[PDB]
Every structure is written in C-alpha cells, then in structure tokens.
Structure 1
Amino acid sequence: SLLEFGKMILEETGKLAIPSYSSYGCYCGWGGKGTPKDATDRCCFVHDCCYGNLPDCNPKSDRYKYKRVNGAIVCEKGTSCENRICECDKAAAICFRQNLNTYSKKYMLYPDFLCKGELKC
C-alpha cells in the first residue's frame, strides 16, 4: 500500500513521498504519459510498469510487511499480490536512492502538455 511505499521512500531517501515524488515529471504520482524527464522519472515509469504487471492486485490499498536486514529491504511472506507489490515498491525506493544526485526541483509540479512521446513498458 501507499503507507508502506511512502515510508520506504522516506527511509531510503530522506524525502517525503508527498510532495517530492507525488507530482514529479511525467510519471511520479497521478497517471503517466510521454517520455520520462530524467532518471527519477524513469524510476516512476518502471514502477508504473511493475504495477501494470499485476492487473488483479490492488497496490495502493493492499498492505504488505517488510523489514530491514542490515540496510537491506526484505519483503516478508504475504499473499502472492503483496509479495509482488512489495518487490515493485522496493525497486522504486532503491532506484530513487540511486538517482538522488540528479533529482531536480525544476520537475516538481511538472505541467501535463509537456509530457510528450510514446514509451511502452
């Protein structure tokens, strides 16, 4: 769920999911269209794709459990949906952490009409 995902992001990056990552670029947050603007936006794109692989899971509302084994995020055993949601979210958090250096405030609240292009998952 968004509860788990938001927490993961904050632990990982030190930034609050809302509003650092809820309206960044073309893909972070509501919907997705166009070509991702940067590395961070590509993480959101890949994350949307990941969820897109689970048409009968409910990633926003279904809660899973995870723990940290030393630094590392480890998804705990739940239903099959919970496990796969968790792996999607975990990958996004790490991707965010890996691209914190190129994160750009210029892309916060990015206007929709500038999200142009086709990108398939």
Structure 2
Amino acid sequence: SLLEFGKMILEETGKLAIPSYSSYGCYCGWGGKGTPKDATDRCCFVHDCCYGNLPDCNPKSDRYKYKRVNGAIVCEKGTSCENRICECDKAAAICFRQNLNTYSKKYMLYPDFLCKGELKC
C-alpha cells in the first residue's frame, strides 16, 4: 500500500514521498502520459508499468510486509498480489536511490500540458 511505499522511499532516499515524488515529472503521481523527463521520472514510469502487470491487485490499499537485511529490502511472504506489489515498490525505491544525483526540483509540480509524446510499457 502507499503506506509501505512511502516508508520505503524515505528510508532509501531521505526524502518524503509527498511532495518529492508525488508531483514529479510526467509519471510520479497521477501521471499517465508523455515522455518521462529524466531518470527519476523513468523510475515512476516503470513503476506504473509494473503495477499495470497486476490488474486484479490493489497496490494502493493492499498492505504487505518487508524487512531490511542490512541495507537489502526483503519482501516477506504474503498473498501473491502482496508479493508482486512489494517487488514493484522495492524496484522503484532502488531506482530512486540510484538516480538521486540527477533529481531536479524544476520537475516538481510539473505542468500536465508539457507531458507529450508516447511510450508503451
């Protein structure tokens, strides 16, 4: 659920999900169109696509458990939807950490009309 995804992001990057990653670029947040603006936005695009592979799951409200083995994020065994949601979130969190160096505040509250073009998952 968003509760877990948020904690995961804070732990990884030191930034709070809202508002560092809730209105960033074209895909971090509501976002569903155009070309991702940068690497961080690409993390959100892939994350959206990952959720897209689970039509009968509810990633926003479905809660899962995960532990930290010294750095490493380890998804704990739950229902199959829970396990797959967790893997999607874990990947996004790592992708965010990996691209912290290029995160630009000029992409926060990014305008909708500038999200142009198209990209299939």
> What's the TM-score once normalised by structure 2's chain length?
0.99
**What is the match of residue 41 of structure 1?**
41
Instruction: Output the CA distance in 2 between the equivalents of 1:38 and 1:118.
Output: 15
Scaled by the length of structure 1, the TM-score of the pair is 0.99
**Take 1:50 and 1:118, find their aligned partners in 2: how far apart are those partners?**
17
Which consecutive unaligned segments of at least 5 residues does structure 1 have?
none
For 1:38 and 1:31, the matched residues in 2 are separated by 14
* Structure 2 CA distance for aligned equivalents of residues 112 and 64 of structure 1: 32
SS at match of 2:63: coil
Task: State the 1:31 CA deviation.
Answer: 2.8
**3-state DSSP class of the match of 1:15?**
coil
Structure 1 outlier segments of 4+, above 3 Å: none
Q: RMSD value over aligned CA atoms?
A: 0.4
SS at match of 1:90: helix
Q: Distance in 2 between matches of 1:17 and 1:108?
A: 12
Aligned to 2:82: 82
Structure 1 position 39, deviation (Å): 0.1
Q: Residues of 1 paired with 2:51 and 2:80: CA distance? A: 13
What SS does structure 1 have at the residue aligned with 2:93? helix
2:13 and 2:120 map into 1 onto residues whose CA distance is: 28
Taking the aligned partners of 1:37 and 1:76, their CA distance within structure 2 comes to 33
Following the alignment from structure 1 to structure 2, what is the Cα–Cα distance between the partners of residues 90 and 8? 7
CA offsets 1:20-62 (integer angstroms, 9 cap, x no match): 0000000001131000000000000000000000000000000
Distance 1:25 1:114 in 2: 9
SS of the residue 2:74 aligns to? strand
Query: What does the per-residue CA deviation read over 1:66-117, in whole Å, with 9 as the maximum and x for residues that have no partner?
Result: 0001110000000000000000000000000000000000000000000000
**How many matched pairs?**
121
Q: Distance in 2 between matches of 1:96 and 1:85?
A: 17
Identical aligned residues as a percent: 100
Q: Give distance in 2, aligned partners of 1:12 and 1:71.
A: 9
> What is the alpha-carbon distance in structure 2 between the residues aligned to residue 70 and residue 108 of structure 1?
31
